[PDB]
Amino acid sequence: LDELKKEVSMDDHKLSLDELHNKYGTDLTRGLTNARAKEILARDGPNSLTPPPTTPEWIKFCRQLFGGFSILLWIGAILCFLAYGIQAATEDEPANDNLYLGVVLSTVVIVTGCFSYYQEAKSSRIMDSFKNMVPQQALVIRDGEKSTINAEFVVAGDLVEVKGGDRIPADLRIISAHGCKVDNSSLTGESEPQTRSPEFSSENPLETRNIAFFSTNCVEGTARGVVVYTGDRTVMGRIATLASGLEVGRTPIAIEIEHFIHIITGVAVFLGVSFFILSLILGYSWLEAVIFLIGIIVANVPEGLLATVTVCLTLTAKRMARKNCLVKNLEAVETLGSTSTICSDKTGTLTQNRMTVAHMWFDNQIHEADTTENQSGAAFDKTSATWSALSRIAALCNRAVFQAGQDNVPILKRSVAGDASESALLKCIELCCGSVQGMRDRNPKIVEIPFNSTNKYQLSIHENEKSSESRYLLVMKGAPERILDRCSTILLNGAEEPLKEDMKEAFQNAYLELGGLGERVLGFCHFALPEDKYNEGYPFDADEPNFPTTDLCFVGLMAMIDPPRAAVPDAVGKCRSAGIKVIMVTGDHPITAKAIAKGVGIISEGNETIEDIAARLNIPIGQVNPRDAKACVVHGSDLKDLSTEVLDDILHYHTEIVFARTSPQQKLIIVEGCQRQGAIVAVTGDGVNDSPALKKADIGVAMGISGSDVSKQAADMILLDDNFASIVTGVEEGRLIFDNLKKSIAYTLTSNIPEITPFLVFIIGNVPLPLGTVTILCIDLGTDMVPAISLAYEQAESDIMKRQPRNPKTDKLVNERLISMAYGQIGMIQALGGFFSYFVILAENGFLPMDLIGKRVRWDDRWISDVEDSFGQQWTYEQRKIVEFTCHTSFFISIVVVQWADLIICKTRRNSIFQQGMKNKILIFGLFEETALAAFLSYCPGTDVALRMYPLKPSWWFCAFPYSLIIFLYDEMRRFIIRRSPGGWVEQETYY
Amino acid sequence: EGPDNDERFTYDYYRLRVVGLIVAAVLCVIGIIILLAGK
Amino acid sequence: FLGRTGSSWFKIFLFYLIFYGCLAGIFIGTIQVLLLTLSDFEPKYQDRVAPPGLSHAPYAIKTEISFSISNPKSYESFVKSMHKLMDLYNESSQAGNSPFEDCSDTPADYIKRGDLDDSQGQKKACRFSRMWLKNCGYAEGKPCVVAKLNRIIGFYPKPLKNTTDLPEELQANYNQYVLPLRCAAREKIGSIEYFGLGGYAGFPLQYYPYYGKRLQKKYLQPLLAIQFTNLTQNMELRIECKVYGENIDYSEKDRFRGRFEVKIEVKS
Ligand SMILES: *[C@@H]1O[C@H](CO)[C@@H](O[C@@H]2O[C@H](CO)[C@@H](O)[C@H](O)[C@H]2NC(C)=O)[C@H](O)[C@H]1NC(C)=O
Ligand SMILES: CC(C)CCC[C@@H](C)[C@H]1CC[C@H]2[C@@H]3CC=C4C[C@@H](O)CC[C@]4(C)[C@H]3CC[C@]12C
Ligand SMILES: *[C@@H]1O[C@H](CO)[C@@H](O)[C@H](O)[C@H]1NC(C)=O
Ligand SMILES: [Mg+2]
Ligand SMILES: [Rb+]
Ligand SMILES: [Rb+]
Ligand SMILES: [Rb+]
After folding, report:
1. Which residue stretches of A854-960 are H helix?
2. How many beta carbons lie within 10 A of that of residue A202, not counting itself?
3. Domain limits at B21?
4. What angle do CA A471, A476, A477 make, to 5 degrees?
5. Out of A345, A698, A739, A869, which one is annotated catalytic?
6. Which residue among A518, A913, A983, C62 has the highest number of C-beta atoms inside a 10 angstrom radius?
7. Is residue B3 part of a domain?
């Protein structure tokens, strides 16, 4: 469906003005007829974007109500009402058991539904942001007259007019223009104004001057044009549809959840029906056969687990909110940890998005300035008298000014009225020479010639601030070579000197080096005009050369670039040390893209492209073995004629990849290419041209300050302070939460065994029921909750940023090793500790373990109010039941006591508690509150009715203590083996 | 005692409940203290 | 195979065999020590049987015994359980001076055979003749229910003293030696008739205290036969038999805590 939109567009900028009118039945001068425009409206439809059909929240909520655990809990809830129905008909049961348990279980499903619904959130308003880029109104020429109309009423063929400050209402063929410049950052991510004129200037319509696009704005001048595309058919309207239309897809974390749901659901249905038939064979009435099944359901399903996961995710997202990293989708909290490839935009993401002075060439020396936002570098020069001469030209031969009321904000961050290069120079001098306004007050400008297309230079004449002179100084800047052809002397370390071929060659060298760094280079020179030839009232003519512009003194060079953000180089290296592949994907030109790649460490030192090898060896590129080149730089124009299989080979064959001059669909294609190889991919960006890629990414991260509204709609995560170091933190947090989820899951599952085994022995042994159904829910929904959550606050056991990204195909959240430990080893020890306390309670009340076998028949018989114990005493029905429920209560408390040790062992997968310590305060809180809850549930009056919880005698609490301790020792010995031999036996069997 | 051994079939479940609830409360307070060591 | 290789499948079996073996051996060990802390003659706790339950022979479907006099197999179900109990109180079962003793044919005081020790043989229990149960196949019309006080080791059932008012106000009040049992329904549409030891409507105190199964096997607890020769027919009659005493109490939950709940209906 969207495969059409993933392709490069076709256009009609090649046609003549006249020819273009024939195609759209239009007038170049009079414009369309009121009738013809209305006709075309009904024909083509409105100049608007329609949002894609969404899934209502209704269906979204209910889709969770049927996912493995909820299905089993539904079967339980209904099976409760089943047994209740069968009762209400047969023998009038005045009880509330099956009825209430059926109500409780149905509530558990609904509430669990809210948790998973909260986790599976999708806040997407892509198409809405795009719609915000179409103006409310447009100016059209109809019947030879200009009028404002609803922009939706704009059709292909009419004559539209735009001017500085307004949004392009539709894709236009420029037919007339006067000084028109446009901001195409929507399509390129670059905000430098692009001229628009009627002349065709490139075969590529996205590069030609005679096309203006919807989603962009006119920055200055005026233009008229013929509408060629409207609504969804515009270049960026298609990007809108592509972006808004892209299928979301399941996250890595989501896939893991479903996976263990299958496992646990599997064992649940297995043991469920495996013992349902095992009971009927033993001659159990279907009346009972279902009651046992309900218990089996409740025992096997970890009722509180899915909600635990959600809370652990939420708590991890809260910590990241506190580092200026907003998470829109709870699952995106983990994806960053599983990320193996980052596709990053350059401008406004890796870079500050601001022309900044990078180097200066004066005194036959290359000086480097500090490009960082917060200025974390050092000085270059202050002493040289040459510097002050260059500094003066940079301030004086400059027409840029700071906007009013910025004195509060830092120099480099403040808004400037002017072109990017003049702003850069302004901020450079203001920083290291103080107030520039001061320099422009001490040296009043009397005449100037602003930068001309033809002159290729800008000159200014000022009253020298010096009192002993107060004469006229000439300054000029422009193209380095043009400035050179106008110089005779060079200000070396203070004093001038003739411009010999020697210094002239050093100039060329300096010029070539700076240009090689992808930096824009300017020349600077001045000339102190002779006093006798220029009186204090001498008039200077700016129109006609009234003053010399030759034999001037060359002062120096200055170079500039849109520099990396301070934290970016280090963040890139850190991603790469964690084994994450970092690719650059930018709408910017290749020379600039490549230079920043080396600056931030995308391309490491020494690595070459095929073009680099060819130039170094002075040989044809076809003569170069492409396998000798680990780095590559792909232009979008070449990308366009490559198949995906060939794109896949590029991705496979290079470690250091730069995709430059890419369109928005091309970014999507590169992302998909990476994913196709089985990689989890993150995208980082800030422009509307990142929207499709951000949507398709497993996780999209947008910049918060510099980011466009669209990009932040398309993302899963926002960096609110533009701190790229947050990606590094995000991946670290993502890995940590992945491990801690394992700990929390094992902990929760472990207690399933002591809830399953009592029901089994109840059938096979014919003893009184050791633990009840209600009692199970008091564990999974009550006591285990805070402890399970607390594992989310566990510190790393080792340097997680030192390991490679997990293999999502092999490294699962829940594997066989977890089940073996939780179900086969620790849970089994917990089961016994439960049974022990059960036998203790009964034996101390007169029913010794031996006489318990095959007694349930008489025990449950409501009409036998005289059962004989081991000592020959006789018990009524309600009397023995009180002891039985007291057994449920102590078995319950036994679970809590054995979960103490389990909580401590689940703390660490490898390390010892004596190494990791007990610095998790939430965990300790869990221990205290868990025990408080259990005690309250046993001793609070009335709980014997609502939950069948009975007061325990002090000695009862200590039954499971020896089992709780064996767990601690056992797991500590086991992990001691793991560490002592990384070989594999204990490791490959039990290492979560 | 002999025929007056009524105490043999008696248990102070009332005190046990009072003590049990005291303990539960104090464990609840202790937990808050440790948690609130930083929020 | 599914998971691993044969070598791995073996090792995982050798482990869980030794592992579960140890766990079973430990579990058993903790059961040993538990038993080691317990007496053979007396349970550690008795507060959960404390107030004695009162149970009867007619096995009630739901605290009810409804049947038809004009039908044979209508009551043959209740006669099965009635027989089961009384069959134990046979004279052939109580033979010789061992381990039985002839006790007062009239309600007497308690009998202490020492302590709950094995320092003596089987503590000798009082004989009880089912022949003390006058009038009661059993009552084919108007049932002859048999009551019973639940056995509790070292329990001395103490009758109420005639200090103040009483339900069966002072009638045949053998204050010193009888634990009374008065059945009731207002709703007085019946005819209560009690049979027992010495002809009294109670339990003779000479059968106490019970020394337990280990120290007193073949021991016999006193019975109290109750006959309802009601002149009514074809209606559910809620009859409650209540025992009175210092050590006797009741509960709204446990409807068998020192009392009966019988729903007789001679639907004939
Ligand atoms: C306990 O006493 C009952 C009294 O009914 C015995 O029942 C006797 O059963 C036999 C054989 O079935 C009959 O011939 C008699 O008529 C019954 N009564 C009597 C008085 O002998 C019963 O057998 C006795 N049980 C034991 C174990 O001795
Ligand atoms: C109540 C009692 C009788 C039930 C005992 C169940 C035992 C036999 C179960 C419980 C957990 C189970 C193990 C759980 C995990 C694994 C790892 C997997 O890669 C192979 C099977 C294996 C090794 C299972 C084998 C059987 C097992 C040990
Ligand atoms: C009980 O049986 C005796 C004979 O043993 C008889 O005289 C008497 O009438 C019976 N009593 C009743 C109330 O039927
Ligand atoms: Mg950008
Ligand atoms: Rb469970
Ligand atoms: Rb995404
Ligand atoms: Rb559990």
Report:
1. 856-859, 877-905, 913-916, 921-939, 943-946
2. 12
3. 11-35
4. 155
5. A345
6. A518
7. no
Is residue B22, in this structure, part of any structural domain at all?
Answer: yes
List alpha helices for B1-39, DSSP H.
13-35
Specify the 3-state DSSP secondary structure of C2: coil
**C211 and C113 in one domain?**
yes
From the number of C-beta atoms within 10 Å of its C-beta (0-12, 13-18, 19+), residue A845 rates as buried
CA distance linking residue A560 with residue B2, whole number of Å: 107
Atom of ligand 1 nearest to the CA of C88: 1
Asked if C29 and C51 sit in the same domain, the reply is no
What is the number of domains present in chain B? 1
We report the CATH number of the domain holding residue C48 as: 2.60.40.1660
Question: What is the structure's resolution, reported in angstroms to one decimal?
Answer: 2.8
Structure determined via? X-ray
Q: Do C8 and C46 fall within a single domain? A: no
C53 and C1 belong to one structural domain: no
Residues linked to residue C194 through DSSP beta bridges, in sequence order: C226
* H or E element that contains A446: strand A445-449
Q: How is residue A756 annotated by DSSP?
A: H
Cα(A754)–Cα(A959) distance, integer angstroms: 15
- Identify whether residues C140 and C217 lie together within a single domain: yes
Residues A885, A888: Cα–Cα separation, whole Å: 5
User: Neighbouring chains of A at 3+ CB pairs within 8 Å?
Assistant: B, C
Alpha-helix runs per DSSP H in A282-383: 286-300, 305-321, 332-335
Residue B4 included in any domain = no
As a three-state string, the secondary structure of A782-825 is HHCHHHHHHHHHCCCCCCHHHCCCCCCCCCCCCCHHHHHHHHHH
Specify the residue for token string 């996976």: A259
| C120 and C253 in a common domain | yes
Residues A423, A244: Cα–Cα separation, whole Å? 37
Q: After which residues is chain A broken (C to N over 2.5 A)?
A: none
| CATH numbers and ranges of domains, chain A | 1-46+126-245 (2.70.150.10), 63-116+246-339+725-992 (1.20.1110.10), 340-352+564-724 (3.40.50.1000), 353-563 (3.40.1110.10)
- Between strands A717-719 and A325-327, the pairing is antiparallel
From the CA of A866, how many Å to the nearest CA of chain C? 6
Asked if residue B1 is part of any domain, the answer here is: no
Structure tokens at A63: 């889709």
**Domain identity same for C134 and C64:** yes
Q: How many residues does chain A have?
A: 992
Half-sphere CA count of A562, side-chain side, radius 13 A: 21
Counted domains in chain C = 2
Degrees, nearest 5: CA angle A237-A242-A247: 150
CATH code for the domain of C26: 1.20.5.170
Residue A495, classed as helix, strand or coil, is strand
Give me the domain span that covers residue C231: 39-268
**For testing contact with chain A, the best of B10, B18, B30, B33 (most A CBs within 10 A):** B30
> Six-digit token pair at A388?
């002050």
Residue type, A509: N
Both C144 and C95 in one domain: the answer is: yes
Q: How many CB atoms lie within 10 A of CB A861?
A: 12
The answer to whether A327 and A719 have CB atoms below 8 angstroms apart is no
Are C43 and A844 within 8 A, CB to CB?
yes
Please check whether residue C62 touches A, CB under 8 A.
Answer: yes
> Is B20 at the interface with chain A, CB within 8 A?
yes
Angstrom CA distances, A389 to A366, A382, A396, stand at 16, 11, 11
What residues does ligand 2 touch, defined as CB less than 6 Å away? A 757, 760, 816, 819-820, 823-824; C 3, 12, 16
- List Cα–Cα distances, A925 to A307, A319, A383, in angstroms: 19, 19, 62
**Rounded to an integer, what distance in angstroms lies between the CA atom of residue C129 and that of residue C223?**
10
Give the burial string for A440-469 (b: 16+ CB within 10 Å, else e). Answer: eeebeeebbbebeeeeebbbbbbbbeeeee
